[PDB]
Amino acid sequence: MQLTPFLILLRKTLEQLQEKDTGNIFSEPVPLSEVPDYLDHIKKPMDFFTMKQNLEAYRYLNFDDFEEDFNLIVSNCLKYNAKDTIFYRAAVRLREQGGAVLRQARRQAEKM
Numbered sequence: 738m739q740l741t742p743f744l745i746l747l748r749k750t751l752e753q754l755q756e757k758d759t760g761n762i763f764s765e766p767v768p769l770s771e772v773p774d775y776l777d778h779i780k781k782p783m784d785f786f787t788m789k790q791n792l793e794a795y796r797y798l799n800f801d802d803f804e805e806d807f808n809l810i811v812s813n814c815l816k817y818n819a820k821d822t823i824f825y826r827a828a829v830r831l832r833e834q835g836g837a838v839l840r841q842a843r844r845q846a847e848k849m
């Protein structure tokens with residue numbers, strides 16, 4: 738498999754995932770200034786902007802590493818927030834809608 742089409746695919750996939758985050762709550766890192774206790778149990782913060790930077794730094798060279806960081810966006814949010822919050826439900830919805838996006842993209846990658 739060749740690097741350029743793979744990265745093209747990840748760029749598109751990231752945009753597609755970002756589209757699911759309609760509230761844009763996962764677009765940027767959790768503001769430690771607004772949420773001071775955040776790092777106390779979240780050992781690897783993640784967000785779509787950071788994923789973009791990792792992508793263009795050639796840090797995602799296979800689908801799994803890409804999907805791992807997406808999954809962190811979701812699990813960090815589920816971990817930090819109580820179940821009866823908008824945040825927690827947004828992460829569930831992202832997991833759900835994101836999963837379909839990722840499966841389709843992976844099958845595109847396996848044709849390469």
Ligand SMILES: CCOC(=O)Nc1cc(-c2ccc(C)c(NS(C)(=O)=O)c2)nn2c(C)nnc12
Nearest residue numbers: 761762763765766767768771772814817818824
């Ligand atoms: C007991 C309160 O718990 C929380 O405040 N949790 C969370 C809070 C925020 C959050 C707050 C305030 C602001 C201003 C932002 N800004 S932004 C541009 O990232 O949307 C984000 N994100 N977040 C994410 C993801 N996951 N959990 C949380």
